[PDB]
Short mmCIF file of C-alpha atoms and ligand atoms in Angstrom, two decimals:
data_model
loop_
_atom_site.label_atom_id
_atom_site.label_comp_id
_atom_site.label_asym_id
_atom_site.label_seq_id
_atom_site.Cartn_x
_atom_site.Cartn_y
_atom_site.Cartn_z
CA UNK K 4 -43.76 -101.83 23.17
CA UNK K 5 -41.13 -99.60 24.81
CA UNK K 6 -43.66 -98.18 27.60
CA UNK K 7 -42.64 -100.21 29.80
CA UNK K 8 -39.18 -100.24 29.52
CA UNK K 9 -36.23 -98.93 32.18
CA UNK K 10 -34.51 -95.66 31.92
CA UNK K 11 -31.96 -94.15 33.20
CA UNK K 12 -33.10 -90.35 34.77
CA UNK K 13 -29.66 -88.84 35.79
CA UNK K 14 -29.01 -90.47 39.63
CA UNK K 15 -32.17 -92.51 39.28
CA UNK K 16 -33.70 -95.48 37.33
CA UNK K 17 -37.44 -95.40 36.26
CA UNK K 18 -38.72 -98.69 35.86
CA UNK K 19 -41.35 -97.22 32.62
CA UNK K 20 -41.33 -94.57 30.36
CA UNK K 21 -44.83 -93.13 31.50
CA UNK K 22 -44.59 -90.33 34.07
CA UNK K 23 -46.50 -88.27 36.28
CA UNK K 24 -46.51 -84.68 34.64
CA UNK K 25 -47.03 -81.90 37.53
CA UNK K 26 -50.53 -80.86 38.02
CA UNK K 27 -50.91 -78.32 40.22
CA UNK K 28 -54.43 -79.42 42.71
CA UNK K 29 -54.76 -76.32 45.20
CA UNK K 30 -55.17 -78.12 48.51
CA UNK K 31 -52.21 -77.33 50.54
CA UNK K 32 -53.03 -75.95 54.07
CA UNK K 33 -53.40 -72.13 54.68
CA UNK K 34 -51.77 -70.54 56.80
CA UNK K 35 -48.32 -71.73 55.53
CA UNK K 36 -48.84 -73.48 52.05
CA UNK K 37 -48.54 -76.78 53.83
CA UNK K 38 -48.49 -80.31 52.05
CA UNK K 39 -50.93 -82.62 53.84
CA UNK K 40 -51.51 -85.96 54.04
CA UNK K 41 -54.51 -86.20 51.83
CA UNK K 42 -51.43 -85.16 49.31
CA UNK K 43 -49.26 -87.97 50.82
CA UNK K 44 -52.20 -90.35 50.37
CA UNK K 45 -52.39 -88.97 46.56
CA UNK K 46 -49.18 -89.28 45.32
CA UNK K 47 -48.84 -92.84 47.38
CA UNK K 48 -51.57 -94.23 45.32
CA UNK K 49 -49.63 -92.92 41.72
CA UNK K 50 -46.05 -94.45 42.79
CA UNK K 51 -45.82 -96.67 40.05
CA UNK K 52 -45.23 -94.42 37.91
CA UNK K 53 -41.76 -94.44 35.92
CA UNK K 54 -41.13 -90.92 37.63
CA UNK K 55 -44.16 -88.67 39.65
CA UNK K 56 -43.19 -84.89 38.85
CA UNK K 57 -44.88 -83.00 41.58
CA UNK K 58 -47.35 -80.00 41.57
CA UNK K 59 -46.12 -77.18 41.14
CA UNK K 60 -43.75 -75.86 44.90
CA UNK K 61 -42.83 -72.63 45.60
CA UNK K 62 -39.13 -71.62 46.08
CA UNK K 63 -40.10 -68.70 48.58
CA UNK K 64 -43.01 -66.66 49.75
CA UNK K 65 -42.63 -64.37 47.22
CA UNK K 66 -42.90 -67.01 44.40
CA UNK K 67 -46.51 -67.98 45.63
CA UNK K 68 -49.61 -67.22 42.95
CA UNK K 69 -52.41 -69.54 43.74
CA UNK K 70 -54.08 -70.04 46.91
CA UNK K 71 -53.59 -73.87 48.15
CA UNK K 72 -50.17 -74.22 46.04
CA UNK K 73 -47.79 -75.47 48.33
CA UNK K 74 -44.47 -74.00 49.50
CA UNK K 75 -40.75 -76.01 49.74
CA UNK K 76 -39.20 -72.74 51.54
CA UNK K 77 -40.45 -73.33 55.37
CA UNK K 78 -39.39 -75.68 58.42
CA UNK K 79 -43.22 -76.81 58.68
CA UNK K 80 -43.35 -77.25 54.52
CA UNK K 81 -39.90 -79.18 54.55
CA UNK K 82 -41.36 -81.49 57.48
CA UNK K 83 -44.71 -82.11 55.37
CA UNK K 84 -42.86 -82.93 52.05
CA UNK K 85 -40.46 -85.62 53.88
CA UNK K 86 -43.47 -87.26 54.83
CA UNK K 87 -44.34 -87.52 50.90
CA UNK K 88 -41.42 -88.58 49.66
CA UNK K 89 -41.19 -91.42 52.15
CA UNK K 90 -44.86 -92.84 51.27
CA UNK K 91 -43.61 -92.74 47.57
CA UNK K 92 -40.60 -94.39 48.27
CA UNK K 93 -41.86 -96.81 50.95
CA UNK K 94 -43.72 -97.81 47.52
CA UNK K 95 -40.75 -98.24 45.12
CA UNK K 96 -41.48 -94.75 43.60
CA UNK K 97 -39.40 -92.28 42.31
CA UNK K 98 -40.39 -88.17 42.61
CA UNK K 99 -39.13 -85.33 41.30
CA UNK K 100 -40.17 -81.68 42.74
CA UNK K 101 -41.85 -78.96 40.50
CA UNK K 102 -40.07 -75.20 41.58
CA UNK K 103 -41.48 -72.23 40.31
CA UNK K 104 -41.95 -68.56 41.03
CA UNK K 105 -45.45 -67.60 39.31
CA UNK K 106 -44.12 -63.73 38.74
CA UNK K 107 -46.70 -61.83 38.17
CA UNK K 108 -49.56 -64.68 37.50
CA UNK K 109 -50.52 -63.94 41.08
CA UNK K 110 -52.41 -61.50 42.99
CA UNK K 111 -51.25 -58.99 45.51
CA UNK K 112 -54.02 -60.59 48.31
CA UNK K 113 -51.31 -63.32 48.67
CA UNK K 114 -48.13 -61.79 48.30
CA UNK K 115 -46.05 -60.86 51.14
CA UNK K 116 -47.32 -57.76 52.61
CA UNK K 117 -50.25 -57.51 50.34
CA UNK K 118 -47.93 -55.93 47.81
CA UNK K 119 -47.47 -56.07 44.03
CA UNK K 120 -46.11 -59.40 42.76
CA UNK K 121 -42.91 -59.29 40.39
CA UNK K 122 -41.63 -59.81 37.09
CA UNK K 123 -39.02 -59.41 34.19
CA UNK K 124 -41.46 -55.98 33.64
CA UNK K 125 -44.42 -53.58 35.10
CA UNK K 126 -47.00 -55.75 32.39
CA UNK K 127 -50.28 -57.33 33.88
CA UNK K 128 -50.42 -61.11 32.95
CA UNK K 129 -54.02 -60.19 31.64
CA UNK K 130 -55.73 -63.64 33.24
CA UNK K 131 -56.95 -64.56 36.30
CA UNK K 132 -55.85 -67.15 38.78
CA UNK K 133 -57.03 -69.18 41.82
CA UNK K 134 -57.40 -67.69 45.47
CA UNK K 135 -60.20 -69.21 47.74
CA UNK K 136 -63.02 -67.67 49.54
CA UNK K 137 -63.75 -67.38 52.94
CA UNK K 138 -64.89 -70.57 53.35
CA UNK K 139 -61.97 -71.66 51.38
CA UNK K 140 -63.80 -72.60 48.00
CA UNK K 141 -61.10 -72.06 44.83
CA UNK K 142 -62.48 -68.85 43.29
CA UNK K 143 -60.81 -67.25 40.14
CA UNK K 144 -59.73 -63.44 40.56
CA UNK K 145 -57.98 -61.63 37.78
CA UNK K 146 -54.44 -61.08 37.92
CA UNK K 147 -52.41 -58.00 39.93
CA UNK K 148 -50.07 -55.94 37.69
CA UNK K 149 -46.59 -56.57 38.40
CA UNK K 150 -43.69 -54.38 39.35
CA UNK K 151 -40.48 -55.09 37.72
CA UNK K 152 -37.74 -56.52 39.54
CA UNK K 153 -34.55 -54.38 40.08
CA UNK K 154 -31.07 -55.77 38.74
CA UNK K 155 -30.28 -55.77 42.25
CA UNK K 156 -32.79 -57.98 43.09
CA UNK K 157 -31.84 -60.51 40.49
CA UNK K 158 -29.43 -62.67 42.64
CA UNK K 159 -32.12 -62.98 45.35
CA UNK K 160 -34.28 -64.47 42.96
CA UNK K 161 -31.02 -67.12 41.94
CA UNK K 162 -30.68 -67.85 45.63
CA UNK K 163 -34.17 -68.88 46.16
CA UNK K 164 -33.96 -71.43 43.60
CA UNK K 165 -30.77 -72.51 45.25
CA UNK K 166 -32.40 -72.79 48.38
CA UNK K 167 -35.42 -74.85 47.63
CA UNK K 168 -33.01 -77.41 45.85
CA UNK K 169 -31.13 -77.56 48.86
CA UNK K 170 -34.57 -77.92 50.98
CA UNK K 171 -35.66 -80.48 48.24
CA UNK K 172 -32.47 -82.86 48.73
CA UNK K 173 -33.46 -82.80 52.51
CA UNK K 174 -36.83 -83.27 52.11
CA UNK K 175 -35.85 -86.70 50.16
CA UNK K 176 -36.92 -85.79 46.55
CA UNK K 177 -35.44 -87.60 43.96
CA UNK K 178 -34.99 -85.12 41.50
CA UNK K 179 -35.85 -81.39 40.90
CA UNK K 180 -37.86 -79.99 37.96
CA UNK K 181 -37.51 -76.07 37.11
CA UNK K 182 -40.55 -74.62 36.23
CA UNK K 183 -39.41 -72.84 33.04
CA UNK K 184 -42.24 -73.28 31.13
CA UNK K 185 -46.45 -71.87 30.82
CA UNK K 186 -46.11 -68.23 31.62
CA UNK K 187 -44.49 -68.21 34.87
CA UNK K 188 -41.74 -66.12 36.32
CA UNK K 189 -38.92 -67.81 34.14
CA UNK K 190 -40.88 -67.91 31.17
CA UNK K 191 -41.43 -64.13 31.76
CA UNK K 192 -37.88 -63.74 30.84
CA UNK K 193 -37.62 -66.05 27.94
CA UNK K 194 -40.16 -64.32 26.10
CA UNK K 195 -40.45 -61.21 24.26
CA UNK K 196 -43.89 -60.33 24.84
CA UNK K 197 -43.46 -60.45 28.65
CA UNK K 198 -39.80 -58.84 28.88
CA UNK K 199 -39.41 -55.44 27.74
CA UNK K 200 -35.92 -54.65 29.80
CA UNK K 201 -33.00 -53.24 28.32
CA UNK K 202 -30.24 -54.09 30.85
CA UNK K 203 -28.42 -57.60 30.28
CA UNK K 204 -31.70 -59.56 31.19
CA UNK K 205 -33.75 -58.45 28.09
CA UNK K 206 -33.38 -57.76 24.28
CA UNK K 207 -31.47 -60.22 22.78
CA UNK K 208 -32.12 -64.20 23.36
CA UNK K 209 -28.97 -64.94 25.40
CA UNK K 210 -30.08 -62.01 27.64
CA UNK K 211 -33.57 -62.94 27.85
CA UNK K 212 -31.82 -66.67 28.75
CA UNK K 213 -29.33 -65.29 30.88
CA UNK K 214 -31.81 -65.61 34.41
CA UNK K 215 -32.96 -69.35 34.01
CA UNK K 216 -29.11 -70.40 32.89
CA UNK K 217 -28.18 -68.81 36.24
CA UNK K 218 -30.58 -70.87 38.23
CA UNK K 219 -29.50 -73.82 36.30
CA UNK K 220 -25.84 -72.97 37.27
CA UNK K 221 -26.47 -72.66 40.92
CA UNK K 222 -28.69 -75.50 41.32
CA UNK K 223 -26.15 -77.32 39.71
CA UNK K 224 -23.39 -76.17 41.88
CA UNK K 225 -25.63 -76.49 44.83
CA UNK K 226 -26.40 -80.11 45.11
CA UNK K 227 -25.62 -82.06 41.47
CA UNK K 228 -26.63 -81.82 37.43
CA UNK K 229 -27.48 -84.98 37.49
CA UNK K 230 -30.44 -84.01 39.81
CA UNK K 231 -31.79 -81.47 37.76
CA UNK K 232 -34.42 -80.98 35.31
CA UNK K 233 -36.38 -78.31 33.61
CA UNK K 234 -39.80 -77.93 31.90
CA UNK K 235 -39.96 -75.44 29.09
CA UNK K 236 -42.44 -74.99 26.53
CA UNK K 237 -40.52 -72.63 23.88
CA UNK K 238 -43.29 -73.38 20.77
CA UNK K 239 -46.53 -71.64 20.66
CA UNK K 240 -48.31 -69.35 23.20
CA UNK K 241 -49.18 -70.33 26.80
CA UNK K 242 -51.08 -68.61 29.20
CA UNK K 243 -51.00 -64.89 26.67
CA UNK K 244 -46.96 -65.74 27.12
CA UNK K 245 -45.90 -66.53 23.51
CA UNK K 246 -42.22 -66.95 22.59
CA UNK K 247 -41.33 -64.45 20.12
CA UNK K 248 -40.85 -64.43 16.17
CA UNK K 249 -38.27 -66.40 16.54
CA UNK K 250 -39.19 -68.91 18.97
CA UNK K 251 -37.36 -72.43 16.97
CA UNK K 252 -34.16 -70.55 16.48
CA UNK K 253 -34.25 -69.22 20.07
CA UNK K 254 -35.49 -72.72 21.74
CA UNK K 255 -32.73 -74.30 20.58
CA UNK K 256 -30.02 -71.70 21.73
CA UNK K 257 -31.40 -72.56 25.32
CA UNK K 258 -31.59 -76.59 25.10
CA UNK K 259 -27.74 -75.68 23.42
CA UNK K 260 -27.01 -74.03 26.73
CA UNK K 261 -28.86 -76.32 28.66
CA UNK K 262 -26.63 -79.70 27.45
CA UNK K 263 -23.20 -77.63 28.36
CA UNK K 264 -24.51 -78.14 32.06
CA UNK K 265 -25.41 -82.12 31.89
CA UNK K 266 -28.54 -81.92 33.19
CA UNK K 267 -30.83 -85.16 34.38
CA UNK K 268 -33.11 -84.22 31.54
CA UNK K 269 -35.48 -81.78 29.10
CA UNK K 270 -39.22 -81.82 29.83
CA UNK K 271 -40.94 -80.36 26.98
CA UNK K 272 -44.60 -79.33 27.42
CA UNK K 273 -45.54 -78.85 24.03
CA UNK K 274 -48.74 -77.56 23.23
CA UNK K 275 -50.93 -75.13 25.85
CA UNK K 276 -54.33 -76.91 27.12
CA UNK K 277 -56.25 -74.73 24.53
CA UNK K 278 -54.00 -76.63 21.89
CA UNK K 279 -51.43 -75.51 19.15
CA UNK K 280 -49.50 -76.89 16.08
CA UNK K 281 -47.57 -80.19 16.69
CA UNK K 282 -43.64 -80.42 16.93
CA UNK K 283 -42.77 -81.27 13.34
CA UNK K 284 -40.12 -84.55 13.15
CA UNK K 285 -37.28 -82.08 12.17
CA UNK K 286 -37.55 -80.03 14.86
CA UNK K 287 -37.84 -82.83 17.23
CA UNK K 288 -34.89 -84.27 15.70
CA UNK K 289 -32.69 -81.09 15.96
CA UNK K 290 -33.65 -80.97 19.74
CA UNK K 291 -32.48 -84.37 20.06
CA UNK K 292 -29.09 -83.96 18.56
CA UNK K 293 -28.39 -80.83 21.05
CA UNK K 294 -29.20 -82.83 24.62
CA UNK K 295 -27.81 -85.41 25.86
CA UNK K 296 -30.33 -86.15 28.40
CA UNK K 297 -33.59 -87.62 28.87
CA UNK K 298 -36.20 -85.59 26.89
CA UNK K 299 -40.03 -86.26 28.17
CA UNK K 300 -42.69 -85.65 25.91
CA UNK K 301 -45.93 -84.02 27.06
CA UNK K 302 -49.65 -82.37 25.79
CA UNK K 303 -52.26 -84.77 24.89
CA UNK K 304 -50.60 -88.00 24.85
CA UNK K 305 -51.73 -91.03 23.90
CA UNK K 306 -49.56 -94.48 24.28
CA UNK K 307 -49.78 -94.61 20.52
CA UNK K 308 -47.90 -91.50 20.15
CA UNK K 309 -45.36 -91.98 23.01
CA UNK K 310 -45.14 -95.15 21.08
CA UNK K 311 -44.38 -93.78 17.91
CA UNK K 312 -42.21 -91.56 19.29
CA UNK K 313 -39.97 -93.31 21.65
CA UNK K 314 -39.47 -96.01 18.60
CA UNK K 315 -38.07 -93.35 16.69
CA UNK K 316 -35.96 -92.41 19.39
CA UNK K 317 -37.04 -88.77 19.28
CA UNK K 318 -38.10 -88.79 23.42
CA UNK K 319 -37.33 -91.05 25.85
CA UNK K 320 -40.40 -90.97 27.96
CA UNK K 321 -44.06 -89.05 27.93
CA UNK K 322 -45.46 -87.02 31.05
CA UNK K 323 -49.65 -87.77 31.32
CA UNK K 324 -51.34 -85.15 32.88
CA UNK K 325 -55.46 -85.54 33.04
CA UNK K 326 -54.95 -89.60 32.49
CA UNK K 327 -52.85 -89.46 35.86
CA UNK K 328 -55.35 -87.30 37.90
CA UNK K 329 -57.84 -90.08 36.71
CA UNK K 330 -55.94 -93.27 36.94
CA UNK K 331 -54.07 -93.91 39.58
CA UNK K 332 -52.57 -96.96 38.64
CA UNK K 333 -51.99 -95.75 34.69
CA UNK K 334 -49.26 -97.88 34.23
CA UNK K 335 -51.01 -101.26 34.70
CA UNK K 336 -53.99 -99.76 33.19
CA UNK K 337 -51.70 -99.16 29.61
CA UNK K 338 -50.07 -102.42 30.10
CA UNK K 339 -52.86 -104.36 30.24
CA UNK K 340 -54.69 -102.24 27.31
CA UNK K 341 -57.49 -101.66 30.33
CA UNK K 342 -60.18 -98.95 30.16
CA UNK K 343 -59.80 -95.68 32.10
CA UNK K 344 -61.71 -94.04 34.47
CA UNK K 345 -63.35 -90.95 33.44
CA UNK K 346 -61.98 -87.30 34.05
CA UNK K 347 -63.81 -84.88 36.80
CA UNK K 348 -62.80 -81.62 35.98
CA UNK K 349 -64.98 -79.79 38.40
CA UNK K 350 -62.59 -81.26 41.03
CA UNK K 351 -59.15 -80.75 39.36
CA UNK K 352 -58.81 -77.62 41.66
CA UNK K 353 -59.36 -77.17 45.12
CA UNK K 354 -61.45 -79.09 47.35
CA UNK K 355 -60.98 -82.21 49.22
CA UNK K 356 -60.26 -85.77 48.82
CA UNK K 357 -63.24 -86.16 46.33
CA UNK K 358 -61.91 -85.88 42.68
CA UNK K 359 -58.41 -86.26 44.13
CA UNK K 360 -58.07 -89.84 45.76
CA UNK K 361 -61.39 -91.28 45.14
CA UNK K 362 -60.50 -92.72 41.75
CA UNK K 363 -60.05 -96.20 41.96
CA UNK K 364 -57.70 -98.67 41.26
CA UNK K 365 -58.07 -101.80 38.96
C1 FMN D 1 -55.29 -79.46 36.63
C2 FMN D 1 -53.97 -79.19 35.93
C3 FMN D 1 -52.88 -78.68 36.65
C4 FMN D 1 -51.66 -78.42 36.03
N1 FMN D 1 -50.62 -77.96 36.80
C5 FMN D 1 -49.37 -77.86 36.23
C6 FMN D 1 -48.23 -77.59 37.02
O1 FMN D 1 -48.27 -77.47 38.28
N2 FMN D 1 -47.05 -77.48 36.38
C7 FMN D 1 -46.92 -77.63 35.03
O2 FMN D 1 -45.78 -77.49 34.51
N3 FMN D 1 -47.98 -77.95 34.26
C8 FMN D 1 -49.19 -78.09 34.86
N4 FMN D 1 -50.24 -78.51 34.10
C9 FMN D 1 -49.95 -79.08 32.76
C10 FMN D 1 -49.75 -80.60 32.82
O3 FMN D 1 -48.49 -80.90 33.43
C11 FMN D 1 -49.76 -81.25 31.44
O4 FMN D 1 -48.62 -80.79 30.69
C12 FMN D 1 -51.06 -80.98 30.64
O5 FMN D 1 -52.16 -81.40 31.47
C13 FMN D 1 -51.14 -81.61 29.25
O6 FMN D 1 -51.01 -83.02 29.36
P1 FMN D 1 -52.31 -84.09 29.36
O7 FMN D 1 -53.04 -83.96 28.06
O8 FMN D 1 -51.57 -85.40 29.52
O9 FMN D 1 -53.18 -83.73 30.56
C14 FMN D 1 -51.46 -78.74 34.68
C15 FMN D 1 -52.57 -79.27 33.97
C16 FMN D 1 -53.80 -79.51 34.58
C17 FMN D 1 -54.93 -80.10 33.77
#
């Protein structure tokens, strides 16, 4: 058994291999997207895990796309998350923060304004996703088409990232996690079905790249690379956002690009809930040779296959989702080859502390 075995995450040291993958649970505080402590209380209870990755965060108003997500761009947010990190730590935990911008998987009833959310193009999302009612109840609404974003608006977008990794550091995370990954507003970029531009941030891969290497350069630059990682998920289709015709070739032009910068480490979300075809060996193996980082593993993990794969030395470590919203002690729970308790789905969005901190311990 490897599980249970240390790593090295760029400036930090997880004590197992089995991490926290972000799961985004819509009870932040409105007015302001503010982190709570029921949320404290929550990710207190999961701090043995080798690394928690957070929910989801956005980078600025703008970014927001679900009611109840919560915000890292706001004196009152900044406040609330230091209050998180300290449980986890007062723990022995390690936690990384989730950034994203949802583009246009959002809805203009939330955006600044009430106006149009943005993207890489003017293309509606074609899903829905979660607002809440008026007595605050998570409610599903279908998505608002987006407007594209200007070139000149492009380096705002950059900033914001910069910011909220700058906010992070103060608000004591650990590491940060880019949100490249499921449809949202970098993923917009990456893929060809969601990016129909023809200035240097479309067409071609290294132009549909050319935004999230940006980010990754100023988050870099703004506090250190061994701080940062990203979540991608370059095979298959996620959330109508596929990645092209030539999705294995283009993949690994980015995690290329990616190991010039010396990242913390590649977070690979592999299949979509709704399933797709499993990473073959080779490719695994031709990811592997171009980082130099710690690659996590994620989609419908079991030990046996984080196992299996970590003993080939493929990944380093595996992200559990659903098992995590369930278990809040995982780790001992896979140790000690204990059962688990069983998933509530009706509660994995919105709602209170039941379905969120009411699962128990061993
Ligand atoms: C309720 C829920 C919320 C999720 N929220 C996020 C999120 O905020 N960010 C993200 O990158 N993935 C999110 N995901 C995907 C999970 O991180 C994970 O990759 C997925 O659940 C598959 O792993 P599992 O089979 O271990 O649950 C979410 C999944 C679920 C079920």
């Amino acid at each position: 058994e490897k599980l249970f075995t240390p790593l090295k995450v760029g400036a930090v040291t997880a004590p197992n291999r089995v991490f926290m993958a972000p799961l985004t649970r819509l009870r932040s505080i409105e007015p302001g997207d503010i982190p709570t402590p029921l949320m404290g209380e929550y990710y207190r209870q999961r701090a043995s895990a080798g690394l928690i990755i957070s929910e989801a965060t956005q980078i600025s108003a703008q970014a927001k796309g679900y009611a109840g997500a919560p915000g890292l761009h706001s004196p009152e947010q900044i406040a609330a998350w230091k209050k998180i990190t300290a449980g986890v730590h007062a723990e022995d935990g390690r936690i990384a923060v989730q950034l994203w911008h949802t583009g246009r998987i959002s809805h203009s009833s939330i955006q600044p304004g009430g106006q149009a959310p943005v993207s890489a193009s003017a293309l509606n999302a074609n899903t829905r996703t979660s607002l809440r009612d008026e007595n605050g109840n998570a409610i599903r609404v279908d998505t608002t088409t987006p407007r594209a974003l200007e070139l000149d608006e492009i380096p705002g977008i950059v900033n914001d990232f910069r910011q909220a990794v700058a906010n992070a550091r103060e608000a004591g995370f650990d590491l940060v996690e880019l949100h490249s990954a499921h449809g949202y507003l970098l993923h917009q970029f990456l893929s060809p079905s969601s990016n129909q531009r023809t200035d240097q941030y479309g067409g071609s891969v290294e132009n549909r790249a050319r935004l999230v290497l940006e980010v990754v350069d100023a988050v870099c630059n703004e506090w250190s690379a061994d701080r940062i990682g990203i979540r991608v998920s370059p095979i298959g289709t996620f959330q109508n956002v596929d990645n092209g015709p030539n999705e294995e070739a283009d993949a690994l032009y980015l995690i290329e690009e990616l190991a010039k910068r010396g990242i913390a480490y590649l977070h690979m979300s592999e299949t979509d809930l709704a399933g797709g075809k499993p990473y073959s060996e080779a490719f695994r193996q031709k990811v592997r040779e171009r980082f130099h980082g710690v690659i996590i593993g994620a989609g419908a993990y079991t030990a046996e296959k984080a196992e299996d794969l970590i003993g080939k030395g493929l990944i380093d470590a595996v992200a559990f989702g659903r098992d995590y919203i369930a278990n809040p002690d995982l780790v001992a729970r896979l140790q000690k080859k204990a059962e688990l308790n069983p998933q509530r789905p009706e509660s994995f969005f919105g709602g209170g502390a039941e379905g969120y901190t009411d699962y128990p311990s061993l």
